[PDB]
Amino acid sequence: EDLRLHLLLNTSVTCNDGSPAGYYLKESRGSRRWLLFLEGGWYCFNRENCDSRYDTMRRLMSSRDWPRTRTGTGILSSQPEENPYWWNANMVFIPYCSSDVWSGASSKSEKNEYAFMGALIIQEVVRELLGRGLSGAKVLLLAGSSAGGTGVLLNVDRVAEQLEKLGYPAIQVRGLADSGWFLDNKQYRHPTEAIRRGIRYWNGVVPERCRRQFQEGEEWNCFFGYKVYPTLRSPVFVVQWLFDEAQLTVDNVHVQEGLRLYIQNLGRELRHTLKDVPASFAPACLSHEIIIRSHWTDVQVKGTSLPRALHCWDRSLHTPLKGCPVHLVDSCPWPHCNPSCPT
Ligand SMILES: O=c1[nH]nc2ccc(Sc3ccc(Cl)c(Cl)c3)nn12
Numbered sequence: 001e002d003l004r005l006h007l008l009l010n011t012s013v014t015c016n017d018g019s020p021a022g023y024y025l026k027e028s029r030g031s032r033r034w035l036l037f038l039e040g041g042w043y044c045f046n047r048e049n050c051d052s053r054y055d056t057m058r059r060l061m062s063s064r065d066w067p068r069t070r071t072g073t074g075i076l077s078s079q080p081e082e083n084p085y086w087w088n089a090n091m092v093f094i095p096y097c098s099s100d101v102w103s104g105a106s107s108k109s110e111k112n113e114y115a116f117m118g119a120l121i122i123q124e125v126v127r128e129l130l131g132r133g134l135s136g137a138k139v140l141l142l143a144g145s146s147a148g149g150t151g152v153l154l155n156v157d158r159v160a161e162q163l164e165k166l167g168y169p170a171i172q173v174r175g176l177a178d179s180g181w182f183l184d185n186k187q188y189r190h191p192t193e194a195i196r197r198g199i200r201y202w203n204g205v206v207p208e209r210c211r212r213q214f215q216e217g218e219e220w221n222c223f224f225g226y227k228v229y230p231t232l233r234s235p236v237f238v239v240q241w242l243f244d245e246a247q248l249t250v251d252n253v254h255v256q257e258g259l260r261l262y263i264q265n266l267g268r269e270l271r272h273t274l275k276d277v278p279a280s281f282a283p284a285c286l287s288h289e290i291i292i293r294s295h296w297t298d299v300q301v302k303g304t305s306l307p308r309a310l311h312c313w314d315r316s317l318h319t320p321l322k323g324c325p326v327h328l329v330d331s332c333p334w335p336h337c338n339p340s341c342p343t
Contacts, residue, residue, distance in 0.1 A: 001069035002026050002078065003093055006128070012107070013124040015097030016050065016061035016114040021121040024070045024093040025132070026078065032138040033089035036125065037076055037292065038155075039096035040146025040179070045198035050099060050114055061097055061114075074292035075143065075176075075307075082294055085307040086141070090133065094125055101195075101223065102144075102151025103204035116202035122155050123162055130168070137171045139314075145290035146246065149180020149239075153225055156234045157207050174317070175236035176310070178291045181225035182247055183269055188262045191250045196220045207231060226273035237279040237313050237326075239306065242267040243335045245288040264333050274329050279313045281306050284330035285341035300340045301328035 003024035011020045023036075041060045044050035054061050072091050077083040096118075098104050104116025122142075126134070134140065142159055144152045156175035163171050184192050198204060199219055206222035209231040214221040222228040229236065243263065247270075248254075253262065267284060274280050283301050290296075297307055304312075304325055312324035320326075330338050 001071050003070045003072050003076070003091055005066060005068050005070075007063060008121075008124050009128055010124055013117055013120050014108065014115045015063050016099050016116070017054070017064075018108045018115060019063040021097055021117065021124070022063055022066070022095065023125045023129075024095070025129075026072060026091040027133060028078070028088050028090045029133070031088045031090055032136060033086055034092065034129070034134055034137045034140045035075065035086055035089045036092040036094060036140065036142050038094050038102055038122070038142070038144030038148030038151040040144065040148040040290070041096050043101050043147060043198055044099045045194045045201055047113055053099060059095075059097070061099055063095070063097060066095065073294050074296040076292055077294070082297070083307070084297060085310045092125070092129065094121065096148060100198065100202040100204060101147045101154065103154050103199065103206065104202035105205050106203035116204070118151065119155060119158065119205050122151075122159065126159055126162060127166070130166070134171075135168060139172045139174060141174050141176055143176035143178065143291070144180065145178040145292060146180060149177040150182070150223055150225070151180070152177040153180060153228050153232065153236065154206060154222070156236060157232055160234050172317070173234050175232075175234055176239070176291070177225065177236060178239040179241065179244060179246070179288070181238055181240040181273070182244075182250075183226070183266070183273070184224050185251065185266065185269065187251045188253045188259065190252060192220055195223050229277065235279065235317060237281070237310065238274065238277050239281045239291060240270065240274070241287045242270045242282055242284045242330060243286040245286060248286070263335070267333055271329055271331065277327070279316070279326045280329060281309050282329040283341060284332050284335065284338045286335035287342050289342045295342070298340060299338075299342065301330055301338065304328055
């Protein structure tokens, strides 16, 4: 239980119910690497939907019951055996308590039952960390899984801009988006409406260049990785299972020819969206498993693990590298055609 909770000193930056947001921190003095990880957990998009989430998913909406510590696992582990990539980094876990895919900038008020402050939570965590050693960082890697992976795409450039404006131009801000790269595709049997409604409910914010492309009312487009990614300036590494379980759930896939063709086309479409993403890791697996898994080291694409690919990405950011690839997308067309897929 090695990351310690800090509730935000600015108590106006709040979780959904007005309780303070916060972050869990394990410092590694001497390391100039900082990993800020955004937790996932879907979202809620209206009063009634959020009320239900408050009853049975309250930790995603409130800090009142948070534990004082959390153990870092996977990419947040400090043990080299568990985390070959960044075991010596300063570790930050930012709990998801805003239910807004990290996009919100609205307070609880006379007219708002809930606060949706995800974008402000990230900014305030960054600001408070600067006084705790982040001012000396060389790399700030903003990582996240699921809704937190989409949150990386929505926020990485805003963090880069925030640090520049605060006077820290030497800190290199980068993103790692895990399991947050979705397709606005046709369902197999019959989400974009929910995001469209959520955005209005949350006063949700999207990256400026993407906003300017899609214009008013169409900001939901920027929640889809393949549309927002090309607009981003910060280096972003994309991790995405080709057959992500949450993608299949929203596609209402739970094998006959029609479903076989559907699943094969989904993998082909996902692979196509990653062709021009030079730092990516996309195994041909059906999984919801994420990079804070203790066994995240086990999967390989073309013989290269994700910790290796991330290390090669670090080297690339110091012309492709001999034996150290960064673009790793499976080409085989069916779940678990990669033998290293999670069981
Ligand atoms: O936290 C988890 N686990 N699985 C999922 C799936 C989607 C989401 S939020 C989201 C993100 C992007 C898009 Cl384009 C849309 Cl429509 C919704 N969060 N999430």
